[PDB]
Design a protein around this ligand. Structure first.
Ligand SMILES: Nc1ncnc2c1ncn2[C@@H]1O[C@H](COP(=O)(O)OP(=O)(O)OP(=O)(O)O)[C@@H](O)[C@H]1O
Ligand SMILES: Nc1ncnc2c1ncn2[C@@H]1O[C@H](COP(=O)(O)OP(=O)(O)OP(=O)(O)O)[C@@H](O)[C@H]1O
Ligand SMILES: [Mg+2]
Ligand SMILES: [Mg+2]
Length: 1246
């Protein structure tokens, strides 16, 4: 699958300058659409691993020199020391080009001097005119040929720098410790890799012009001084009064960029709690809660960028304002001093200014802004690089060949600001062949003991020793993108004789046989495709298949069915891991009979540590075609999209009256700019005629109205300046408003998407369009729209000025125009698909980064950092190839445009003499300079239009999401009564649920009756449909059959109205980043009294009050500070505070100790004893006292009756399941069920 080599490496200079190696690519793109197998590979020196590892050495040398100097490090010094060698050589080309751009007007003015004094006698004049023509061609060739190659090399260097910085940021994020994890979130890294690197490839382009500005300005001032006297110093004064203002604007630009960045960080941080928990938001109708925050943050960000956009508009208006400013300046003095201008002074002035402005007034403020943004970018990258790194594992001592884990007197602190430690007095050891059992209450430190073995917890007192590889199993399963086989292997080689044994031991055979593809089906991100019980066993199978030496199982039997839990514990831990080192932690009091070492931890204090018989003897107790991968690329059909997107983009900004006032002001500014030069030429001609008539017998002396002329010129100039300023401000404001409206519409439409979209499209595919695709509309879109509208206006003005001349020069404008149109049409048909492929290849970078930033724990546990870095480098090169191809195509188009313009100039200069041998200056003279200005404006306008089309097809990616077909509306026309549900009777009648249209069936003929105020329990093997039934009830996807709730069909009411009447406890734990008050209730409607009452009921306030800011503690990403027990308690508190009629418990006692479990069960039974509670759990000790228990097997309901009736039948699946888990527990459960049945049936004798 190796892509063909890039023909650039096998090309000479003659084909590299003109980009001749792009003919087959364009010929292929013109016929069919481009694919990923048609993009050329990057050079061997432009790889990600070759640049990142090269810059890392320089960064390490710089930080070592800073540590030796005992000062603060800096990234700019290392960047310079690394990228100055391959960049100082490019300065000589700019130095010679800026000199040629000043030399060219000299010859342009000298060649016209011959036509001004045309004589048919002397041939030396013709000889020197031809020599001037030859040197003019010599200068224009080097000015218009190598400039695009220099731009291409600069863009390549910028892309290399961006790739190196991205690799460095990724390598830094792959080593962040737990302390640094609480200061930064995923949104920060997303922003740093999306927008903070988009300025490096742009700031390295304009610094040359930045430092060459004054050098060319002084040169052109000294050149003008040769003809103009002391009066020319006013122009230098204007320059030295304008440039310091542009330099001082850098501080304001830096402050505005810093504010934009610190706000965009918080704006992007609120993405995981919106997307990854879309089911939790839909099950609680909290979409408006997140919309009240995200749109407000976007409005604040827009208000902050308003000042930056106003400054950019002011600079872009000053760009074309300073030209006429400098025209008026020194001319107000040369006219008032008595001297006059007829043709020569004004002509040389305009011909010099036309070349000076394009650099000085354009690239200087742009370069200032680019440097101001790059400073903030480098500062943020350095701040991210100076975070607290993870404690690297020290060099282990040479052992005697054996492996063991020894911990003696361990003491560490999770948070240095806290007063109490997490662990106290740890002294134990594990040998190969033993079984350690950790038991304790909630929030005691059971998982901290396992985390300390890995190396994530810095030991504050003591020493640890780890000999051998570790296979860690996190409490929360982590499944990345890919098939189940790739998830089990995880870099290991496929071995059927061991894979089948691992599948049989983990009881995954039924799961692989019930699916449609077995172990070859794809799995979405975050394991949204599979269930919790399936991922909990997939992770264990992956850990077992690795064949490691240390197995740190962090409660893998918490979300697994009780019937298969015994089989798993018997055929995966006591048989496979019997010879290895393992530390199993759990809450069940039946698996500890086979363990030889039990550590009863309590609040991080080692109370007891012995065997299982020592606790019973002493008397102490401890219980008190093949489903392609993730819906590959589907963005196609980019066949010259029409005005359908342009109309929407123009209407989302302002009203039609504002849209027409915009073009009115644009044409007014253009006609004023034209009339300025028109009046200047008229005054010059009038002064020439006056000098002629006063030299040829000037009997009368009638001087022109000096005051009137000066006043009208100043008025025209001021009007033009004000019109330009106003139109720039209006355009920028309209474009900012349009971008904000488009972003708001996209955000409002995304929330209304079905649950299938979120788990069929990867996180990266919908995250890269919320930071880069929508962030470009604030950084590149208006700067490209206004730089093209003004260019088109200037082209129209130049054409209207030139049409007033003999059409002998305007006739050949039609073939040139149609050739340019054909070239633009041929180049866009390729550039569109090239940009599409660039976006499609940049998407997987973020798609993999989002999964890596969540699975870094398992990554460090398995030591797959090399594989992760290789995958990241491959994903980055996949996009760098398309970026290089886009840059090469743009440079080839520019080279072709410049070549055609030079050919047209040569033609109009050569083929005109045969007919103008007699036609002198005034009618043939200065026409060459006219044509040069015309071709320059054309070359600028074509590139501007190409860039605008590129930006339009880029924003088309956002515009496409305007429809985003949805499910049933929020509220239908028929509304339920305000007292509904009054009873809560749910009736099913042949209901079927399918996660995808045409997919495998889950619920097959499910019929059950649920009375009012009847506690119904649901049990059965995992992955059977226990959650599918809840999903069909909550209407996450359109089900079959009919579902009646209090004589009301679910398919005839509003989705939000149905979801707001049923509370639910989520199966997986998830918390929102923010304050505890907002996490408990974001609407801010609950009183503190009832909040504390609910906290006391949940039994969490006792430890909540320990923190100083009980209601102000800001949580980390996904609740990194809180544990699984704390997350479950917060979810229970939220469900209690909901206080609705219908309550559905899915998974509430997964990782809960038996004591607090029974406590909260009794509390719930006392509180909600007057409503219908649909509780679901694996442990029967909390549901054996229910009214009826459902038995879901393979989707179909096998039996549904009373628990005692099920126990009285030795053939029932419920009895066959409860027969396991020992004998005493089963007997106690049967006795409790019999007592409950007696008390319910015969109270007269019970
Ligand atoms: N990043 C963190 N910063 C500060 N404290 C933390 C962090 N992570 C966990 N904790 C603390 O550790 C405690 C939980 O410890 P640990 O994870 O070792 O046991 P556990 O597995 O949660 O116990 P159980 O399984 O009974 O819930 C929590 O009370 C929490 O306050
Ligand atoms: N988006 C999806 N695409 C394909 N299949 C899916 C999707 N969502 C769920 N499934 C399948 O539907 C089944 C539903 O299982 P369910 O979630 O009811 O298990 P569970 O009862 O939650 O397990 P446990 O009781 O251990 O938590 C899963 O086995 C899964 O394979
Ligand atoms: Mg735990
Ligand atoms: Mg479930």
């Amino acid at each position: 699958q190796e892509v063909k080599p890039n023909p650039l490496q096998d090309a000479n200079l003659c084909s590299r300058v003109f980009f001749w190696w792009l003919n087959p690519l364009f010929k292929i793109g013109h016929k069919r659409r481009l694919e990923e197998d048609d993009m050329y590979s990057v050079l061997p020196e432009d790889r990600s691993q070759h640049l990142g590892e090269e810059l890392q050495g320089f960064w390490d040398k710089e930080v070592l020199r800073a540590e030796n100097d005992a000062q603060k490090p800096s990234l700019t010094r290392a960047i310079i020391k690394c990228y100055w060698k391959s960049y100082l050589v490019l300065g000589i080309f700019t130095l010679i080009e800026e000199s040629a751009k000043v030399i060219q007007p000299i010859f342009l003015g000298k060649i016209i001097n011959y036509f001004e004094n045309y004589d048919p006698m002397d041939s030396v004049a013709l000889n020197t005119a031809y020599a001037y023509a030859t040197v003019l061609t010599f200068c224009t060739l080097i000015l218009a040929i190598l400039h695009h190659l220099y731009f291409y090399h600069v863009q390549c260097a910028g892309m290399r720098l961006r790739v190196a910085m991205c690799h460095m940021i990724y390598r830094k994020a792959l080593r962040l410790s737990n302390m640094a994890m609480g200061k930064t979130t995923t949104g920060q890294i997303v922003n740093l890799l999306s927008n903070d690197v988009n300025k490096f490839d742009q700031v390295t382009v304009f610094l040359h012009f930045l430092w060459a500005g004054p050098l060319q300005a002084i040169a052109v001032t000294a050149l003008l001084w040769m003809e103009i006297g002391i009066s020319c110093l006013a122009g230098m004064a204007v320059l030295i009064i304008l440039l310091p203002l542009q330099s001082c604007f850098g501080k304001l630009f830096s402050s505005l960029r810093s504010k934009t960045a610190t706000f965009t960080d918080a704006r992007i941080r609120t993405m995981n709690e919106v997307i990854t928990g879309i089911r939790i938001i839909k099950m609680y109708a909290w979409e408006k809660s997140f919309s009240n925050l995200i749109t407000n943050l976007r409005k604040k960000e827009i208000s902050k960028i308003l000042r930056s956009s106003c400054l950019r508009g002011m600079n872009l208006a000053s760009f074309f304002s300073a030209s006429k400013i400098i025209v008026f300046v020194t001319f107000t003095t040369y006219v008032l001093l008595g001297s006059v201008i007829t043709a020569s002074r004004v002509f040389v002035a305009v011909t010099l200014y036309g070349a000076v402005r394009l650099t000085v007034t354009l690239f200087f403020p742009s370069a200032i802004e680019r440097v101001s943004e790059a400073i903030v970018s480098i500062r943020r990258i350095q701040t991210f690089l100076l975070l607290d790194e993870i404690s690297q594992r020290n060099r282990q001592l040479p052992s005697d060949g054996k492996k063991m884990v020894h911990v003696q007197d361990f003491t560490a602190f999770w948070d240095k600001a806290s007063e109490t430690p997490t662990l106290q007095g740890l002294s134990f050891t594990v040998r190969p062949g033993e079984l350690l059992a950790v038991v304790g209450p909630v929030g005691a430190g059971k998982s901290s003991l396992l985390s300390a073995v890995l190396g994530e917890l810095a030991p504050s007192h003591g020493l640890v020793s780890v000999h051998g590889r570790i296979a860690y199993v996190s409490q929360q399963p982590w499944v990345f993108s890919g098939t189940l086989r790739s998830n089990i292997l995880f870099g290991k080689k496929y071995e059927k004789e061991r894979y089948e044994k691992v599948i049989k031991a983990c009881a995954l055979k039924k799961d692989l046989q019930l699916l449609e593809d077995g172990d070859l089906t794809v799995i979405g991100d975050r394991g949204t495709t599979l269930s919790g019980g399936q991922k909990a066993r997939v992770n264990l199978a992956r850990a077992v298949y690795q064949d490691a030496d240390i197995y740190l199982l962090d409660d893998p039997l918490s979300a697994v069915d009780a019937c298969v839990s015994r089989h798993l514990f018997e055929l995966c831990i006591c048989q496979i891991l019997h010879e290895k080192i393992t530390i199993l932690v759990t809450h069940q009091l039946q698996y500890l009979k086979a363990a030889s070492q039990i550590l009863i931890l309590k609040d991080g204090k080692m109370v007891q540590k012995g065997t299982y018989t020592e606790f019973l003897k002493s008397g102490i107790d401890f219980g008190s075609e093949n489903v392609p991968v993730t819906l590959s690329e589907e963005n196609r059909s980019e066949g010259k999209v029409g005005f359908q997107a342009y109309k929407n983009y123009f209407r989302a900004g302002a009203h039609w009256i504002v849209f027409i006032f915009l073009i009115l002001l644009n044409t007014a500014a253009q006609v004023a700019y034209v009339l300025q030069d028109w009046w200047l030429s008229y005054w010059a001609n009038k002064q020439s005629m006056l000098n002629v008539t006063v030299n040829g017998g000037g009997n009368v002396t009638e001087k022109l109205d000096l005051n009137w002329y000066l006043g009208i010129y100043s008025g025209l100039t001021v009007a033009t300046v004000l019109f330009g300023i106003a139109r720039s401000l209006l355009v920028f404001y309209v474009l900012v408003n349009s971008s904000q409206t488009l972003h708001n519409k996209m955000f409002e439409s995304i929330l209304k998407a079905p649950v299938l979209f979120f788990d069929r499209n990867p996180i990266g595919r919908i995250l890269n369009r919320f930071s880069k695709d929508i962030g470009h509309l604030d950084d590149l879109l208006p700067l490209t729209f206004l730089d093209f509208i003004q260019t088109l206006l200037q082209v129209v003005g130049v054409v209207s000025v030139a049409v007033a001349v003999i059409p002998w020069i305007a006739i050949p404008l039609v073939p040139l125009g149609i050739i340019f149109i054909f070239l633009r049409r041929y180049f866009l048909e390729t550039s569109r698909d090239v940009k599409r492929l660039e976006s499609t290849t940049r998407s997987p970078v973020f798609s993999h980064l989002s999964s890596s930033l969540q699975g870094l724990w398992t990554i460090r546990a398995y030591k797959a950092e090399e594989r992760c870095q290789e995958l990241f480098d491959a994903h980055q090169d996949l996009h760098s190839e398309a970026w290089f191809l886009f840059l090469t195509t743009s440079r080839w188009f520019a080279v072709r445009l410049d070549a055609i313009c030079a050919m047209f100039v040569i033609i109009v200069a050569f083929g005109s003499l045969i007919l103008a041998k007699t036609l002198d200056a005034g009618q043939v003279g200065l026409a060459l300079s006219y044509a040069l200005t015309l071709m320059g404006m054309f070359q600028w306008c074509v590139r501007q239009s190409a860039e605008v089309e590129n930006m339009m097809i880029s924003v088309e990616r956002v515009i496409e999401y305007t429809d985003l077909e949805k499910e049933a509306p929020w509220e239908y026309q028929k509304r339920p009564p305000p007292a509904w549900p009054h009873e809560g009777v749910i009736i099913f009648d042949n209901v079927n649920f399918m996660y995808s249209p045409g997919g495998p069936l889950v619920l097959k003929h499910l019929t059950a009756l649920i009375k009012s105020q009847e506690k119904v329990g649901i049990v059965g093997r995992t992955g059977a449909g226990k959650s599918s039934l809840i999903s069909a009830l909550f209407r996450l996807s359109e089900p079959e059959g009919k579902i009646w709730i209090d004589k009301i069909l679910t398919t005839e009411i509003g989705l939000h109205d149905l979801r707001k009447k049923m509370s639910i406890i989520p199966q997986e734990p998830v918390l929102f980043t923010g304050t505890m008050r907002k996490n408990l209730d974001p609407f801010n409607e609950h009183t503190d009294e009832e909040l504390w009452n609910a906290l006391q009921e949940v039994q969490l306030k006792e430890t909540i009050e320990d923190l100083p800011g009980k209601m102000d503690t800001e949580l980390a990403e996904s609740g990194s500070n809180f544990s699984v027990g704390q997350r479950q308690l917060v979810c229970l508190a939220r469900a209690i505070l909901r206080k609705n009629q219908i309550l559905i418990i899915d998974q509430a006692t997964a990782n809960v100790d038996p004591r607090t479990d029974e406590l909260i069960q009794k509390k719930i039974r006392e509180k909600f004893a007057h409503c219908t509670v649909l509780t679901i759990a694996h442990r029967l000790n909390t549901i054996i006292d229910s009214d009826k228990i459902m038995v879901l097997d393979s989707g179909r309901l096998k039996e549904y009756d009373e628990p005692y009736v099920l126990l009285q039948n030795k053939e029932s699946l419920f009895y066959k399941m409860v027969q396991c888990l020992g004998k005493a527990e089963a007997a106690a459960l049967t006795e409790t069920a019999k007592q409950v049945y007696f008390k319910r049936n015969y109270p007269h004798i019970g």
